[PDB]
Every structure is written in C-alpha cells, then in structure tokens.
Amino acid sequence: AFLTVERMVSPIESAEDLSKQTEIAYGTLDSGSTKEFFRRSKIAVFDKMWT
Amino acid sequence: AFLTVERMVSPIESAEDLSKQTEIAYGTLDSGSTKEFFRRSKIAVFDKMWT
Amino acid sequence: VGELVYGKADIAIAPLTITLVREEVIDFSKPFMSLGISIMIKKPQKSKPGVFSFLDPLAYEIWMCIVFAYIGVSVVLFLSGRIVGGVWWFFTLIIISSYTANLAAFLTVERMVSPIESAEDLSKQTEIAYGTLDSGSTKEFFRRSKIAVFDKMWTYMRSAEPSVFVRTTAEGVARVRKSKGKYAYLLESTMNEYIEQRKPCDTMKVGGNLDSKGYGIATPKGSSLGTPVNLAVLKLSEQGVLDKLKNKWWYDKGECG
Amino acid sequence: VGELVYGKADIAIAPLTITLVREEVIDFSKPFMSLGISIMIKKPQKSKPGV
Amino acid sequence: GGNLDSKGYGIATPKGSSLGTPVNLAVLKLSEQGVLDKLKNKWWYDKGECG
Amino acid sequence: AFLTVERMVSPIESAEDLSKQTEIAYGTLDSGSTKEFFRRSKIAVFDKMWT
Amino acid sequence: KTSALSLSNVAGVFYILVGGLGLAMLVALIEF
Amino acid sequence: GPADCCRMKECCTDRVNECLQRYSGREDKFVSFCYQEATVTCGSFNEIVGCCYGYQMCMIRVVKPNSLSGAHEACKTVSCGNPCA
Amino acid sequence: GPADCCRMKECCTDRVNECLQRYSGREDKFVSFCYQEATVTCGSFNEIVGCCYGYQMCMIRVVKPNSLSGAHEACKTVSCGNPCA
Ligand SMILES: CC(C)S(=O)(=O)NC[C@H](C)c1ccc(-c2ccc([C@@H](C)CNS(=O)(=O)C(C)C)cc2)cc1
Ligand SMILES: C=C(C)[C@H]1CN[C@H](C(=O)O)[C@H]1CC(=O)O
Ligand SMILES: C=C(C)[C@H]1CN[C@H](C(=O)O)[C@H]1CC(=O)O
Ligand SMILES: C=C(C)[C@H]1CN[C@H](C(=O)O)[C@H]1CC(=O)O
Ligand SMILES: C=C(C)[C@H]1CN[C@H](C(=O)O)[C@H]1CC(=O)O
C-alpha cells in the first residue's frame, strides 16, 4: 500500500486544482500583466482565483 | 505497487539524430515555409538535412 | 400554462417546475415538492466472478509453462538435487511473488477507480454520451444557463450527433438500459428516485443535483383561488401530508424500495 | 414580522422560516434557500478499529 | 442523519406592498443565475476550514 | 488493496433512534419554528421527542 | 482491471530456472 | 448584425408600451407578459435579464390600472442596469 | 448609481470625439487612446470591450487626419454590438 502511494501520480495537474483547494495559498505580482489578466478575466477558473 | 501504477516511456530522437542516420528517410512538403526554412537555414544540422 | 392564461382551466396541478418565465405569466403557490436536475445511469453489474478470475492475473501460458517446468523438475530430480531444490525454490518464489503482486494490482486498480461523481465529470469526458428531454424546464435551463459547466454541456448536447434528446421519460430510461451504461439521462431528482425504486432497479442516480428548485400549483394571475391554495399547501406542508404522500407513492410500495 | 405588519420596516431579509402562521399576515417571496430540521452532535475523536 | 422536515427561508414584505413582486422575481432570477448557489458556497463551504 | 484504499465511513443514528434512547439528551431553541414544529407535531416519533 | 498476462517478464526467471536445471543435469552427469 | 443596446432599449420600451396598450385596465397585471414579448421581439444580450430590466421593474412597481400612459412616459427614460447580468 | 448602456454609448462617442480634438492632425493615431480614456470616464460592462466597440472600430478604420468631424458624425450612430464579450 505504501509503495503504491509512493509511485502514485497526480500530485498537481492544472491551474483549476489551485482553485479547488484553500490549503495552499497562491499569488501574483503587485502589478503587471498577470494581475491585470486575472482582474479582467471573465472565464470561470481564473475569475475564482482572482476573487 | 509498480504493477498498480504502471508507467509511460517517451522516446526522443529529436532533430540531430535524423542528421546522424541514413536508416530512416525523412522529408517535407513539396513547397511552403518549412521547405524554405530548410533551404535558407545557415545552421549546420538543418543545412545537412536539406542537402 | 396556456390553458391557465387563456382561461380554459381554473387551476393547474401537476409536477410543474417553477421558472421565472412561467412566474411572469402565471402565479406559483409555494413549492409542495422539492427537486433538482440529476444524472441517471445504468448500475454496474455486481459480480461475474467465474473461476477464470483466479487465472486472470497469471497468464495461461504461465500455467502451462509452470506445469511443464514442474514435471521437468520432477524428471530432473529422478535423474546434486540440492541446487535443483534451490533453483526450483527461487523459481516458485518469484512466481508466487509475481502472482501476489499482480493480483494486488488487480484489486487495487478495481478499488481505485470511480465511474462518475458529478456533472463536471460528465462535461470532461466524451466516452459517455448524455442527454435530456426534447422539451421542458431542464432543456431550457441548459439553454439559458451562463454557468461554465452547464454551458459546455449544452453546447455538446446540441452539437452532438446522433441527437441525445428524447421525447419521453420512459424512452430516456429505456435508452439508459439499452446503452450498457454508455448513455446518461438528465432528469429531475423526483422522477430519478421513482424510477430508481422500481424494478428492474438496474438504474441509479449519481451525485448531487445540478440546481435546486421545486414544483408548484399554478393559478391565473389575479385569481381568487391563489391565496387559499397557497395557504393550503403551507398547511399540508406543516402537517406533513406532503411527506407521507411522497413516501406513499415513491418509497413505501416500492418493490426494490 | 411585527416590524413588517405594523409598518416599522419596508422589508425583511433574514433566515426567516416560511410558516403558515407567518404566511397569513405577510407575503413571502419564493424561498431563496432550502433547509430542514436536523440533528447536530459531537464528532467521535476515534473509531474503534475492531477485531 | 437526514432532515426531519423540508422547508425554506424567504424574503418577507407587507401584504399589498409594491416591492413584493419585484422582490419575488428578483429572487427567481438570482436563483436560476446561480447567485444563491454561489453565495451559499461563498459563506459556507469556500472558506470552510475542516475540508 | 484494502490498505491502499484508505476509505473511512462514519455511521449515523439518524432521527428514529433518538426517540428510542434516554442516554443522550437533546434539545432545541427556547422558541421559534423548530420548537413549534415539535409542539404541533402529530407524527409519533416527533410527538414522543416533544413530550 | 487492466489484465496483465505478464508471461514475457517472468519468462526470464523461467530461463534462469532452465539454466539452473541444465547445470543440475551437468553436475548429476559428472557425479555418475 | 450588431444589436446596439440603446436601440434595443428604445425598441424594448416601445414594444412593452404598445403591448400594454392592448390590455386596458389590466395593464399592471400583464407587465411581465408584454416585457416577455418585447424581449422576444427586440432580442436580448442575456435572455434572463431581458432587453431593459430597469424599465421592467419601474413599470411593475409604478403602473396601476388605466394609469398606463403616464407610468410608461415616466419609466421609459430610466437606466436599464447591467444587460449582461 | 445604476448603469445605462445607452447613456454609456452617448457618453462614449462624446468623450472619444472630445478627446481626439486635442490630437487634431495626428487624429488617426490616437483613436484607441481616446477610446481608452472614454472607456475609463464613461465606464464599461466589460473592461476589454469598452463603452462602445462598434464605434471604436468604425472610427479606427474610417478616421483620416483632419477628417475627424465628418468621421465622428458618420460613426456616432453606428451599432455598438454586444458589450458583454
Ligand atoms: C424557484 C426558486 C426561486 S426557488 O426554488 O424558490 N429557490 C431556490 C432555493 C435553492 C430553494 C429551492 C427549493 C426549495 C424548496 C424547499 C422545500 C420544498 C418542499 C419540500 C416544501 N415546500 S415549502 O415551500 O418549503 C413549504 C414552506 C410551503 C420545495 C422546495 C427551497 C429553496
Ligand atoms: C517582470 C514583470 C514585472 C513584467 C514582465 N512581463 C509582465 C508585463 O509586461 O507586465 C510583468 C510580469 C507579470 O505581470 O507577471
Ligand atoms: C500546408 C501548407 C503547404 C502550408 C501550411 N502552413 C505553411 C505555410 O503557411 O506556408 C505550409 C506548410 C509548410 O510550410 O510545411
Ligand atoms: C416531465 C416533464 C416533461 C416536466 C416535469 N417538470 C419539467 C417541467 O415542468 O417542464 C419537465 C421535465 C424537465 O424539464 O426536467
Ligand atoms: C435562529 C432563530 C431563532 C430562527 C431562525 N429560523 C427559525 C425561525 O424562523 O423560526 C428560528 C430557529 C428555530 O426556530 O429553531
């Protein structure tokens, strides 16, 4: 069982996973294109992340 | 464990190996940007491939 | 609704879903029953073990080869035998370890995977087709939905060929039964529970509801019947009449209930 | 509800359960939330593993 | 266990008030739009610390 | 396989069992819709609980 | 379930088995 | 073909009004129906919101039986709010 | 306060035009800048789209140096399209 957990995959897959858990905090720069991308984004995942 | 998880092996011959072997023939389209790229390329490997 | 607006009927009593478009034309009493859009599939076959599942981990070739190897070792011993016993021990050691490991892999894999959790999983896979009724509140919900998952699902359903839409509930359920679990039917939780409690009981509801809404008794706008009916539904609600009625028709006489 | 009937407030927005006794004096919007009477207990610290 | 009974909350307005139908239709709109759902997820689950 | 699964289920006594035992005391708010539900309840179990 | 049929991998241990039995036949022969 | 929300608004109020004119004395009751028809005829950026929501609410809260003309004349200039949400 | 897509449009065209006026003779270059300023001042339902997108496009392709007045007079009535996405 232990070794099966050891070789087991999927620790992290996508960006969506960050949106689905509050355990790991995450962030961007205080300014620049990225923060603005999250700000102006109307697509679900990134919107949630920005909120 | 390793039977439960299995695995995936991904081979890479990349570009240069094509230059290094006559066993596997290779080619491009009769025309277009790719052919022109190989033609006008001043880089060693691509030059050889074009030749 | 038409019969109510145009005055061909004084009241409408039926599993009529409360929607804003309907609330604009008619008046809805407080909901007498709760429902939501849910997913119905074919329940996986419990067990088809055979005696072949024991010979599944170890290949037929391995059994034949271990038999010939066994008789080979016997006829070798018939003709020093220390290394024979040792080598055979190593052989059967690696083989029993391999069998144990492989079978462990089988059972672990079998216990690890789950077919479907929510609607989001339905949106993320093209393997299992899914659909709704040709008309009604559910189709309209998917159409009018600005929510990501539901939007994607709607795009898929409308674009998908052959059509995933069915005319009747019985047709949809029948399609779920005939498709060997390759077809999922989206229907309100009520009907899902009812069909799930009825034989052959090969169908089941997975995950929660996509949305939370209710049925209601409809009366023409400005009718005298509205407030009495509403207060009546409240009375039946507090008295528990609605609950006992649902248990009566759904669960209690349920054969597989 | 009292503030509503006697006109001390124009509207009441709160986890106000819909009841017939309340539905007689005032008007309730369609329910914005679903609930029901349920039982709350102390979660067991451990589960006896057993033989 | 389950719930003992099934009922709901609601926004209360004086009988014969002009706000009543607008409030009702508003709650329906917010309901279909999923505003109620997202709000509940906001206050209850999203910042939920117990996982 | 079992050990690799790591599935943990927590049983419940639900509503019906609560009426059948004097070991665990239980209660509601001093007033409100819940207390009134128990008070006016014509259902056996709930009646017993109220008594 | 992903049926294994791992015979190819075990075949090697079968080969070291046959090798061991061969050396065994050799020792049995040099003995007599 | 672009919808142009302003033209959508003028059309919205126009169709609502023209519809409500057909129902005399029942004007306050059919506001939502005629608003439905107007959203249908003039189109909408969001099917739920409708062509102009603020005007709809304004009419619903203001309009009394036989009071149609003045009510509409009051409500047609009002801000429609967010047309996409 | 409440948003009005129509008021947003009228304000949009007015502010764009008024902006381009200081840039007279370089007008064809600054269309997008003045559109940005107008989007900021008159507000927008979608930050990307702006107050009126169709007018922006019309101006961008039509406007020639010193040809401003006629260009704006032609483009201000143009349909703004969907101010959602
Ligand atoms: C159409 C929507 C605006 S909505 O359905 O009203 N609101 C959505 C929200 C999530 C919701 C959805 C459904 C219900 C709900 C709650 C209870 C019931 C039944 C079982 C009891 N009827 S009753 O109205 O509560 C009673 C006290 C008479 C039926 C529906 C309560 C709240
Ligand atoms: C490194 C910085 C601050 C720049 C570089 N590119 C982005 C930009 O051009 O705004 C910024 C990074 C970012 O926004 O994540
Ligand atoms: C399909 C053809 C010939 C086109 C497509 N893109 C390249 C182009 O835009 O030229 C060409 C492909 C290539 O150059 O390999
Ligand atoms: C069973 C049918 C066709 C009805 C029942 N409630 C929904 C309604 O009131 O339209 C319909 C089903 C649905 O759309 O999920
Ligand atoms: C929290 C309180 C005191 C309120 C809230 N809803 C119930 C009601 O609307 O009466 C009451 C709780 C209860 O009755 O247990």
GROMACS .gro file of N, CA, C and O and ligand atoms in nm, chain C residues 18 30-34 212-214 233-234 237, chain D residues 18 30-34, chain E residues 6-8 27-28 31 36, ligand 1:
model
  132
  120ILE      N    1  -4.117   2.532  -1.125
  120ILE     CA    2  -4.126   2.676  -1.109
  120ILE      C    3  -4.011   2.745  -1.181
  120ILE      O    4  -3.894   2.724  -1.149
  132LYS      N    5  -4.641   2.835  -0.316
  132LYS     CA    6  -4.517   2.786  -0.255
  132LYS      C    7  -4.498   2.638  -0.289
  132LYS      O    8  -4.594   2.562  -0.294
  133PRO      N    9  -4.372   2.597  -0.314
  133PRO     CA   10  -4.344   2.463  -0.365
  133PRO      C   11  -4.389   2.351  -0.272
  133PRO      O   12  -4.357   2.353  -0.153
  134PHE      N   13  -4.463   2.255  -0.327
  134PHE     CA   14  -4.513   2.142  -0.249
  134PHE      C   15  -4.419   2.022  -0.252
  134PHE      O   16  -4.437   1.927  -0.177
  135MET      N   17  -4.320   2.027  -0.340
  135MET     CA   18  -4.227   1.917  -0.354
  135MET      C   19  -4.093   1.972  -0.401
  135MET      O   20  -4.089   2.068  -0.478
  136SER      N   21  -3.984   1.913  -0.354
  136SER     CA   22  -3.851   1.960  -0.392
  136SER      C   23  -3.785   1.869  -0.494
  136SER      O   24  -3.797   1.747  -0.487
  314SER      N   25  -3.120   2.364  -0.756
  314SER     CA   26  -3.222   2.339  -0.655
  314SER      C   27  -3.347   2.422  -0.682
  314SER      O   28  -3.346   2.545  -0.671
  315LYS      N   29  -3.456   2.353  -0.716
  315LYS     CA   30  -3.583   2.417  -0.748
  315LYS      C   31  -3.698   2.331  -0.697
  315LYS      O   32  -3.675   2.231  -0.629
  316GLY      N   33  -3.821   2.369  -0.730
  316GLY     CA   34  -3.936   2.293  -0.684
  316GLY      C   35  -4.055   2.299  -0.778
  316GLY      O   36  -4.061   2.385  -0.867
  335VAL      N   37  -5.134   2.467   0.074
  335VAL     CA   38  -5.007   2.397   0.053
  335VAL      C   39  -4.918   2.411   0.176
  335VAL      O   40  -4.850   2.317   0.216
  336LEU      N   41  -4.920   2.530   0.236
  336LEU     CA   42  -4.849   2.552   0.362
  336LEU      C   43  -4.901   2.461   0.473
  336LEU      O   44  -4.823   2.400   0.548
  339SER      N   45  -4.797   2.116   0.418
  339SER     CA   46  -4.653   2.108   0.441
  339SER      C   47  -4.623   2.090   0.589
  339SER      O   48  -4.549   1.999   0.627
  377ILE      N   49  -4.036   2.999   0.645
  377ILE     CA   50  -4.171   3.016   0.595
  377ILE      C   51  -4.269   2.928   0.671
  377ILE      O   52  -4.257   2.806   0.671
  389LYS      N   53  -4.064   3.360  -0.303
  389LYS     CA   54  -4.024   3.221  -0.321
  389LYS      C   55  -3.894   3.197  -0.246
  389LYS      O   56  -3.808   3.285  -0.240
  390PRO      N   57  -3.880   3.077  -0.187
  390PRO     CA   58  -3.766   3.052  -0.098
  390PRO      C   59  -3.632   3.067  -0.168
  390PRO      O   60  -3.612   3.012  -0.276
  391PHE      N   61  -3.542   3.144  -0.107
  391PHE     CA   62  -3.410   3.167  -0.162
  391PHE      C   63  -3.311   3.064  -0.110
  391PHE      O   64  -3.198   3.055  -0.157
  392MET      N   65  -3.355   2.986  -0.012
  392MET     CA   66  -3.270   2.884   0.048
  392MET      C   67  -3.354   2.766   0.096
  392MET      O   68  -3.466   2.783   0.141
  393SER      N   69  -3.298   2.647   0.083
  393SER     CA   70  -3.365   2.527   0.130
  393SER      C   71  -3.300   2.477   0.258
  393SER      O   72  -3.177   2.478   0.271
  416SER      N   73  -3.884   1.928   0.536
  416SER     CA   74  -3.827   2.006   0.427
  416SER      C   75  -3.900   2.138   0.408
  416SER      O   76  -4.016   2.141   0.366
  417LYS      N   77  -3.831   2.247   0.436
  417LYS     CA   78  -3.890   2.380   0.427
  417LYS      C   79  -3.787   2.481   0.379
  417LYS      O   80  -3.675   2.444   0.343
  418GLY      N   81  -3.823   2.609   0.379
  418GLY     CA   82  -3.731   2.711   0.331
  418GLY      C   83  -3.744   2.848   0.396
  418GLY      O   84  -3.843   2.878   0.462
  437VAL      N   85  -3.562   3.724  -0.674
  437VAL     CA   86  -3.515   3.601  -0.612
  437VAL      C   87  -3.513   3.486  -0.712
  437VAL      O   88  -3.421   3.404  -0.712
  438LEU      N   89  -3.615   3.479  -0.797
  438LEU     CA   90  -3.616   3.378  -0.903
  438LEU      C   91  -3.499   3.393  -1.000
  438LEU      O   92  -3.430   3.295  -1.033
  441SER      N   93  -3.186   3.301  -0.845
  441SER     CA   94  -3.189   3.156  -0.828
  441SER      C   95  -3.143   3.083  -0.954
  441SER      O   96  -3.055   2.997  -0.947
  446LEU      N   97  -2.763   3.251  -0.578
  446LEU     CA   98  -2.791   3.194  -0.447
  446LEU      C   99  -2.691   3.084  -0.416
  446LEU      O  100  -2.632   3.079  -0.308
  715LIG     C1  101  -3.777   2.881  -0.790
  715LIG     C2  102  -3.668   2.936  -0.699
  715LIG     C3  103  -3.685   3.085  -0.677
  715LIG     S1  104  -3.677   2.857  -0.553
  715LIG     O1  105  -3.690   2.716  -0.576
  715LIG     O2  106  -3.792   2.905  -0.482
  715LIG     N1  107  -3.546   2.887  -0.464
  715LIG     C4  108  -3.421   2.815  -0.483
  715LIG     C5  109  -3.374   2.760  -0.349
  715LIG     C6  110  -3.240   2.688  -0.361
  715LIG     C7  111  -3.478   2.668  -0.298
  715LIG     C8  112  -3.524   2.565  -0.380
  715LIG     C9  113  -3.623   2.479  -0.333
  715LIG    C10  114  -3.676   2.496  -0.205
  715LIG    C11  115  -3.782   2.404  -0.157
  715LIG    C12  116  -3.798   2.378  -0.021
  715LIG    C13  117  -3.900   2.293   0.022
  715LIG    C14  118  -3.986   2.234  -0.071
  715LIG    C15  119  -4.095   2.144  -0.027
  715LIG    C16  120  -4.038   2.008   0.011
  715LIG    C17  121  -4.172   2.207   0.089
  715LIG     N2  122  -4.246   2.324   0.043
  715LIG     S2  123  -4.225   2.468   0.111
  715LIG     O3  124  -4.237   2.569   0.009
  715LIG     O4  125  -4.095   2.473   0.173
  715LIG    C18  126  -4.340   2.500   0.226
  715LIG    C19  127  -4.282   2.601   0.324
  715LIG    C20  128  -4.464   2.555   0.158
  715LIG    C21  129  -3.970   2.261  -0.206
  715LIG    C22  130  -3.868   2.346  -0.249
  715LIG    C23  131  -3.630   2.599  -0.124
  715LIG    C24  132  -3.531   2.685  -0.171
   0.00000   0.00000   0.00000
